[PDB]
Design a protein around this ligand. Structure first.
Ligand code: 5BS
Length: 272
């Protein structure tokens, strides 16, 4: 990673939290192209000091995204570890996380918008699959909206997939159960069962989020009931706008070997 000086970073408003992390908007003073000074908006992810033991995992996640370059992957500017702090410095995406955006804009997000955003996420996951890189935490909160749909231009929305945060392979089991149904059944059984097929399951759950106006599947169920949901081999209910329901269910296959490749997922999406 590129090491960024603390003096060059300015923390501003809190933009929420991740697992064991606080997220902030920030400003980075930098020498840009042609040597001109800029103040660039950045996103700052701070690992909680009480959870500093996850430092490695915390950075590994983002490191995984940094070794590949792709239009649908969020950019990492680097890290600030000068001091007790563990700071990750990423690009600031203007319109924030997709789950929030889907909630706030639900009244005017239609089927074509959902299909375009699903195609983009599928394309990003296909890039990862082709590179045999496991994301491990595909969810609508980890999708960021770079630009909104502009029907006057014909411009579609454009999304980027963010880093997965601290790996489910090292997280406490109660946090893993709270993350049902994003975390696949096999990973509840064994978190070290982290595979490429994991991302197909989680992509299905994310599609459900995208089609459900930002609702959280199974949120009414506590941890015991989410566990039982997997034990009883249930599927999520079809969204009211059910045009993606079969794809959601084909991705959320309890048999990981039977989950479709992202090429087949993309061919389905195009067929819709
Ligand atoms: C880089 N990045 C992330 O990795 C993740 S992963 C899960 C959440 C994020 N976050 C917080 C982000 N929010 C943003 N920009 C942004 C813009 C507007 C708003 S809002 N809804 O307050 O107006 C929030 C975040 N830009 C980028 C991110």
């Amino acid at each position: 990673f590129h090491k960024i000086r603390n003096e060059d970073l300015i923390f501003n408003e809190s933009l929420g939290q991740g697992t064991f992390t606080k997220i902030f908007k920030g400003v980075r003073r930098e020498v840009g192209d042609y040597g001109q000074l800029h103040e660039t908006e950045v996103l700052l992810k701070v690992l909680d000091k009480a959870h500093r033991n996850y430092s490695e995992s915390f950075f590994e996640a983002a490191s995984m995204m940094s070794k590949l370059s792709h239009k649908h992957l969020v950019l990492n500017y680097g890290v600030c570890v000068c001091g007790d702090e563990n700071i990750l410095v990423q690009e600031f995406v203007k319109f924030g996380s997709l789950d929030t955006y889907l909630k706030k804009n639900k009244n005017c997000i239609n089927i074509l918008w959902k299909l375009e955003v699903a195609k983009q996420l599928a394309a990003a996951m296909h890039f990862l699959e082709e590179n045999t890189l496991i994301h491990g935490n595909v969810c609508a909160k980890n999708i960021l909206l770079i630009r909104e749909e502009d029907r006057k231009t014909g411009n579609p929305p454009f999304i980027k997939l963010s880093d997965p945060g601290i790996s489910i392979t090292v997280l406490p089991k109660d946090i893993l159960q709270e993350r049902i149904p994003w975390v696949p059944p096999e990973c509840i059984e064994n978190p070290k069962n982290l595979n490429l097929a994991t991302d197909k399951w989680s992509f299905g759950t994310t599609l459900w989020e995208i089609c459900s106006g930002g609702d959280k599947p199974l949120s009414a169920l506590d941890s015991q009931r989410k566990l039982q949901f997997y034990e009883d081999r249930h599927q999520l209910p079809a969204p009211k706008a059910a045009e993606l329901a079969n794809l959601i269910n084909n991705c959320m296959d309890y048999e990981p070997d039977h989950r479709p490749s992202f090429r087949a997922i993309i061919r389905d999406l195009n067929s819709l």
